[PDB]
Write a protein that binds this ligand. Structure first.
Ligand SMILES: Cc1c(C#Cc2ccc(CN3CCC(CO)CC3)cc2)cc(C(F)F)c2cn([C@@H](C(=O)Nc3nccs3)c3ncn4c3CCC43CC3)nc12
Length: 281
């Protein structure tokens, strides 16, 4: 009944690879916890490199923090297997990452789904703020889909591999200029994440080299208004990208704003075939 289970190899198996990133490879798998009978669908992340006993102490201390993450909109770390290449286990999010989901299902996504994802991501980020955990890499690739109506944040930043140069196009200006990361720099990245959703997974600052992003931000340039977005929604994104971090909304305020929009979603996002979950009025 430990918060973080220390796994043996015999208790789990990899079924199908899902993806590889800068830190490791994720597999869909099955876990029968030692002393139990039930089969639990899991995601298994195997690190890229083998680690020493010393390195593993630093992984473990972080793993206990990730096992303490207990919120409906953030994934919890369930277990660790201290094999030579370490393996990390969560519950499987069977629909994969939200970035791929919105790209693959773009013709069957309405305003209600999009605005409810924005609420849910803000709820999970407000939980991280209450825990004093700065994410440092919020992006649609780091949001997972449990069901089409239920998403969760994962994979905190530990500075899509070609998005890292650090994820410059998601970062607040003060993070680019001085490597300052706070809950308010996570609000900036939340705004970029919302832009990704509202553009069905498009690439931010497409055509701008990463090396020029701080210059264009300093000139006042920002990501453009997505075609589906009313100006009211775009204004919240723009508030997330103000240069003064303390002027940006807080996650608690973003939950209120997106929750109100989610009551009349077709008024805020205009999608062809989406004719005019939080209940709609
Ligand atoms: C990469 C990494 C590491 C690591 C490491 C490393 C160390 C040294 C070296 C050697 N390295 C050599 C080069 C240089 C020399 O100094 C640096 C050191 C190499 C790698 C450690 C931990 C730890 F917390 F468990 C990690 C946790 N995640 C992920 C994770 O487990 N996601 C998964 N998704 C599917 C299933 S689990 C994560 N993040 C947040 N969350 C999660 C899940 C739940 C939740 C939201 C709450 N990711 C981790």
């Amino acid at each position: 009944q430990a918060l973080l289970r220390i796994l043996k190899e015999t208790e789990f198996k990899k079924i199908k690879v899902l993806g590889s990133g800068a830190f490791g490879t994720v597999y869909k798998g099955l876990w029968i916890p030692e002393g139990e009978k039930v089969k639990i669908p899991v995601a298994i992340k195997e690190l890229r490199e083998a680690t020493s006993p010393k390195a593993n102490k630093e992984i473990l201390d972080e793993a206990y923090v990730m096992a303490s993450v207990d919120n409906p909109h953030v994934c919890r770390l369930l277990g660790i297997c201290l094999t030579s290449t370490v393996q990390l286990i969560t519950q499987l999010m069977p629909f994969g990452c939200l970035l791929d989901y919105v790209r693959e299902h773009k013709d069957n996504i309405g305003s209600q789904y999009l605005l409810n994802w924005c609420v849910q991501i803000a709820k999970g980020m407000n939980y991280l703020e209450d825990r004093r955990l700065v994410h440092r890499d919020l992006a649609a690739r780091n949001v997972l889909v449990k069901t089409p109506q239920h998403v969760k944040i994962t994979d905190f930043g530990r500075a899509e591999e070609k998005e890292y140069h650090v994820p410059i196009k998601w970062m607040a200006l003060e993070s680019i200029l001085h490597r300052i990361y706070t809950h308010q720099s996570d609000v900036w990245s939340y705004g970029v994440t919302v832009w990704e959703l509202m553009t069905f997974g498009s690439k931010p600052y497409d055509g701008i080299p990463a090396s020029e992003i701080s210059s264009i931000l300093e000139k006042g340039e920002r990501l453009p208004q997505p075609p589906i977005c009313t100006i009211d929604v775009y204004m919240i994104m723009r508030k997330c990208w103000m240069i003064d971090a303390d002027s940006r909304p807080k996650f608690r305020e973003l939950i209120i704003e997106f929750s109100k929009m989610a009551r009349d979603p077709q008024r805020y996002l205009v999608i062809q075939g989406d004719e005019r979950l939080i209940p709609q009025q």
